[PDB]
Amino acid sequence: TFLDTIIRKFQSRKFIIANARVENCAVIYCNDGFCELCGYSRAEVMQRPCTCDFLHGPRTQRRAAAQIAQALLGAEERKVEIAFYRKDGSCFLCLVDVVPVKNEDGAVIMFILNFEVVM
């Protein structure tokens, strides 16, 4: 469990960790700050694609979602601003920070995604 080593990254941080070795980059961890941010519980978040489609609503731009998808096929850190929706229906502007995690060979094996509310 080196995932716990990564989990060590955990001040009001809101992030998820994704398994890049399955086709949809399923969520294999989400911290309490993230669940609290979006109003969904850990159980409602786990195993979903890390694109967080479940946070999509009317104001979510196709283009911003597309940037995140492209990032998840790359190997560089990327920052995308996107409109997300909490479980209660409220919309928050979000800066998503996609961070690739690599192995000794330099292959991407995970992503960490951090989320920050934007004004």
Residue numbers in the entry: 13 to 22, 25 to 133
The authors write:
Based on these observations we generated a construct of the hERG PAS domain that started at residue 10, the Δ9-hERG PAS; this protein was crystallized and we solved its structure at 2.12 Å resolution. While the body of the domain in the Δ9-hERG PAS is identical to the full-length PAS structure, with a main-chain atom rmsd of 0.74 Å (residues 26–135), the N-terminus adopts a new conformation, with residues 13 to 22 forming a helix that packs against the hydrophobic patch on the domain. A consequence of the packing of the helix against the domain is that it prevents the participation of the hydrophobic patch in crystal lattice contacts. Some of the amino acid side-chains in this N-terminal helix are not well defined in the electron-density; similarly, two residues (E23 and G24) in the linker connecting the helix to the first β-strand of the domain are not defined and it is therefore not possible to determine if the N-terminal helix packs against its own domain or is swapped with a neighbor in the crystal lattice. Interestingly, a superposition of the dELK structure with the Δ9-hERG PAS domain through residues in their β-sheet reveals that the N-terminal helices occupy the same relative positions at the center of the hydrophobic patch of each domain. Our crystal structures of the dELK and Δ9-hERG PAS domains and the previously reported NMR structures of the hERG PAS domain have clearly established that a stretch of the N-terminus in KCNH channels forms an amphipathic α-helix. Interestingly, the crystal structures show a conformation, with the helix packed against the hydrophobic patch on the β-sheet, which is different from the one in the NMR structures. In the LOV-HTH DNA binding protein the N-terminal helix packs on the β-sheet, side-by-side with the C-terminal DNA binding domain, and in the LOV2 domain of the blue light sensor phototropin 1 a small N-terminal helical extension packs against the sheet together with a long C-terminal helix. It is therefore conceivable that in some functional state of the full-length channel the N-terminal helix of PAS adopts the conformation seen in the structures of dELK and Δ9-hERG PAS.
The KCNH family of voltage gated potassium channels includes the EAG (ether-a-go-go) channels, the ERG (eag related gene) channels and the ELK (eag like K+) channels; these channels have roles in cardiac repolarization, neuronal excitability, cell differentiation and tumor growth. A defining characteristic of KCNH channels is their large N- and C-terminal cytoplasmic regions. The N-terminus typically includes a Per-Arnt-Sim (PAS) domain, while the C-terminal region includes a domain that strongly resembles cyclic nucleotide binding domains, but which has been shown to have little affinity for cyclic nucleotides. As already stated, the role of PAS domains in KCNH channels is unknown; it is not known if these domains bind small ligands or mediate interactions between the channel and other proteins.
